[model samples]
Target: KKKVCYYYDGDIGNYYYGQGHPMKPHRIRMTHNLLLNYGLYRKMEIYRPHKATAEEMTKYHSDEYIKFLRSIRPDNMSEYSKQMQRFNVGEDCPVFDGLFEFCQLSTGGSVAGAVKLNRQQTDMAVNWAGGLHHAKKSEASGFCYVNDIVLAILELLKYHQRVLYIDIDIHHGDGVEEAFYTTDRVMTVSFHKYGEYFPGTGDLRDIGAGKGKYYAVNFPMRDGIDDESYGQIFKPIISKVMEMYQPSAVVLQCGADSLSGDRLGCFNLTVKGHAKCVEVVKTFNLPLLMLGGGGYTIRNVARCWTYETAVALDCEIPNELPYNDYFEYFGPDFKLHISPSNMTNQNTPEYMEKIKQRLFENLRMLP
Candidate 1:
C-alpha cells in the first residue's frame, strides 16, 4: 500500500479575501468535511503543519515583500498604498483580517509537506491550503499572497536531484514557471485557457530560455474543452515528460477552477476527469506533493478536491454524494459526477495534433 500524508490547519480556512473577490478560503473547510464524510481521513496520516517562519518564506519571496505582507492591514491601507500597488495587492489580492496569518499557515502546510517528502516519511503529501501559484517573489496576484508551490519546490531541491512541476490550473502557473525559468532542475508544464485570459502569458511558443530551453511547456487550450479531449492531451504529454525528464519528484497543482462550472474558468472537465490527472501522475510512483490552487465555484471546488483526495488514496467512491454537513451545498444534483450540459468541445483533433507535434519537437531539444 502507498503511504500518504495529508497536511492542513484549521486556521487556514478562517481567512477571507474581501467582499466580491472570487477566492474563498472557507472552501478549504468544505473540502475537509467532504473527505471526512466519505471516510477518507482514516486511510492516511494527517498532520497540522507548524506555521512557517519569516526565514522559511524568504526562500522564494523577498524579505521586503514579506515585511510588507506582515505589516499591512486594511485599516492602514492609506499608509501603504504605494507598497500595496508595488505588490499588486489592491482589488484582486485584498488585505483582509488575518491575511498575513493565512499566508503563513497556507505556505507552512506546503513547506511541511515537502519536508516530509524529503525525509521519505510518506509516498504522497497533500496540502489543499497551498498552491497559490500566482504569487510572485515580491508581489501578489490573482488573490495569491505567497507562492507556496515555489517555496515547497525549493525545499524539495534539498533532497531531490530534480523536480517536475505540473499545473492543471485554468490560469497560467506563471509565478512557479518564472521562478524556475532559468533552471533545468524543475521542468514546468501548465495547461491553461489562453488568449485574453487574466495575466495572459502561457503561450505554447514560450518554452524556457537559455539553459532552461524546452524545460517549460505550456498548452494554450481553448474554451469549453471537455473530459475526453482534456484527458487525451493531458495523459500522453505527462507520460512523455515523465519519460524525458526522469524527475526525482513531482508536484501537481490540481486547481479546481478548471472544472465545468467554475465562475472564472471555461473548461468542461468533470470531477472524474480532473481527478484522473492525479491518478495518472500517481502511476509514476515518484514522491508526489499535491497542492490546491484556484477554484471559484465553491461547491465544485469542494467536489473536485474531494474526488481527487479519493483518487490519491486509490479508493473508489460512488456517484451519490455521501451524507455530510455540506450535503445541502450539493443540492439540485446531489451526485458526485457532473453531467456536461451545453458544453462545447472547442479543440479539434487537427489542432491538438499540431500542439502535440510542436511539444514533441521541443522535448527532443532536451539534453
Candidate 2:
C-alpha cells in the first residue's frame, strides 16, 4: 500500500515504569488515546504487535544478558541483586511486574516496524513505545532495558545498506551509538545536550573508530536551545547527511524530552519545533522508522508524539487538542501545542558557528 504500519500493543497492561518514575509507558498509552480522538487512525494500517523473543533480542544482546532480562521480576529482585548490579538495573531500570513482557512489547513493536519497512509494503513504520536508546547490549542505562533501535537497525540492514540513525533525545543515545561504533554501514548521528549530562558520551570528538571514523556524528549543545537554534544545526546538517550519505533507510528517534517544560530536560523546543525534525526527515521520502524515546513530562510527551504522528501522516491537526479521555491533562489551554518557555537561548551564535562548521568539516571528510 506504500502506507504507514503503526504498532499498538493490546496487552500493554501494568508495564508502568513504576510510581514516581519519570519514564512512563503511560505516555505511550496517552499518545494512543490522542491518536484515536483526533481521528488519525484511519489513514494508517494498524498492526497487532508481536512479541520479541529472546532469540530476536539476542541478535544484538548477549545470551546470558537476554536470559537475565527475561526472568527478573518484582518479588524476585533480591534473588537477582548481584546480576542486577552486574547489569545496572536497580535504580533507573527497575524490575517491575510484566517486566520481560514489557521489553517484549517495546522491542517487538520496533522489530515489526523494521520488517514492514524491509518488505517494501510500507513507506513509514511507527512504534511509539520502541526507542529505548540508552539500553546496552547486556546492561541498562537511563531507564532503558533493551536497545530496540539497534535491533531494528540490524533488521533493516538485512535489506538495506547504509542506514542513518538520527537521535534527537535530550540525553545521549550512547547505547545505539556504541553498537555501530566501528561499522560504516550505519551512520549514527545524535543531537544532545553534552557536558555533565546523563550518559555523558556524545562529545564532538567521539567520532567513529576504525572503518567508522567519520560515520559517527555527535552534535553536543548547551542548555536552553530554542527552535530557531536547533533548526540551524538540525535541518541543514541532516540535509547534508542526506546528500552525502544517500542512505536507503532513515530512523528518527522522536524523543520529546527535548521539548520545553520537561521535568528532567532543559531545552526550550516547542511542539511544532520538535515535529519539524520529523517533517525534515520525512522530506527525504526514504523508507522511514519513526520511534519514541526519552520523554519525561508525560502530558507533554503525549502532546509532542501525537502531533508528530499527525506530521508523519502529513495531516494538519489544529492547535486545540481534539476531545479525548485524557483531555484534562492538557488543562487551562487544552491545546495540542504546549507553550514554550522564554528561557535564555544558551548556545551563542559564535559557538553554534564553530560547532556547525566542525560537523560540516566532519561530513566533508566522509568517503
Candidate 3:
C-alpha cells in the first residue's frame, strides 16, 4: 500500500522562456492533464507545491550563484540580470520575471519528495517536474536551474549514507556527477550518449578521483543503442553494484528523451522499456526518489511518468487519462497503441565480455 505524491501547479505555465523555446511550461500542464485523464489521480496522495527557500538551496549551490538567481528579472531586465552573462544564463537560462521563483517551485517539489521519503510518508516519491539535472553551482547550462537533484540528494544524505544516483538522461548528468564526484558517500552513475553532446563532457574513464575513486561510474554509450542494449548493460551492473554497495537510498532520473520518439534524443527506447527501469528498481525496496529528466515529446513524457506512477502505487495501468478534459486537450483519439515489448539483447556476448573485463579490472572494495 505505497503512495505517490504528484505535486504540480496549473500555473507553472507562466515560466516559458519564449514562444519557440523547447522548454515550454505548457509541457508540464500537458503531462498533468494526461495523468488526470488516465485516472492516475485516484491512486496516490496529491500535494500542492511550495517554493524552496534559500537555506535549502544553499545545501548544494554556491552563495554567489543563489544571489545571482535572486537578482535577475527578465521582464524589466535588471542590470543584475545582465550579470547573467557572467553566470552563463543568457541563452540557456534567460532572465524571466520570477526566474528564481520558478526554480524555487520546481526545486520545492524535489525537496518535498525527499521529505516524504524521510518521514516514511511514502514508499516511493516521484516528482515529474523536478529533474533539472544540468544546472551547476555558479552557472545555468542545458536548460536547467537550481540543480534540484543535487539538493534532494543532499537532503537524503542528512539521514543516510551511500546514496546511489542512476541517471539515464540522453545528455550526461555532468552537473550532478560533478557535485559529488569526489565524495565516497554518494555514487553517481550515468549512462548517456557521449562525444560532442550538449555540455560536451562525461568520459567513461572519468571514474572518481582521490577517495572517491571507483564511486563515480560513467557509461558513455553511443547513439542509436536500443532498449535491449540498455537493459543488458544496466541490469547486471546495477545488480552487482547494489549487492556490493548496498546503498541506503536510490535516486533514479528517468528521462523520457531516451525513448524512441524524442526529438532531441538518438536512442530508440519505447515507453515500456523506460518503465522497466522503474520496475527493476522497485525490487530494492529502498526509499526511492524518482525524478523526471529530459523528455521533449509531451504525450510520451506524460505516458511514461504516468506509467511509473502507477507502478509505484501498485495499481493497474489506467488505459486512458483520469479526466475527460485531458483527452480534449490532446485532441480526441490522442492515445497511441502500445508498442510490442522488446528487449534487444543489445549487450552482445562480445560486449558483455568487454564490460565484465572492465568491471573486474576496476572493482575495488568500498569501505
What TM-score would every model get versus the actual structure? Answer: 0.98, 0.98, 0.91
lDDT of 1 by residue, 233-314 (tens): 8999999999899999999999988989888889899888888899999999999999999888898888888888888888
Candidate of highest lDDT: 1
Q: Which residue segments of model 1 deviate by more than 4 Å?
A: none
Candidate 3 ranges beyond 4 A from true positions = 318-323, 326-333, 336-353, 364-367
Query: Per-residue alpha-carbon lDDT of model 3 for 1-367, expressed as tens digits?
Result: 6667777866675777765667766567777776676667888777767889988898888888888788777555556655777788868677666688889888998889898888888888877778898998888888897999999999898888789999988888889989998988888888788778876877778888887888888777665666666777777777877887789889899888888767778777877777778888888889999998888766677777777777787777545445544455444545532443243424355765575457645554565
Over the stretch 25-122, how does candidate 2's per-residue lDDT look in tens digits?
88888899998999889899988788899999999998888899887888888798899998988787888888888889999999999998999889
Clash number by candidate, in order: 0, 0, 11
Better of 2 and 3 by lDDT: 2
Task: For candidate 3, report its TM-score.
Answer: 0.91
TM-score of 1: 0.98
For model 2, the run of ten residues with the poorest summed lDDT: 10-19
Candidate lDDT values, in order = 0.90, 0.89, 0.77
| Candidate 2: residue 244 lDDT (0-100) | 88
Ranking by TM-score: 1, 2, 3
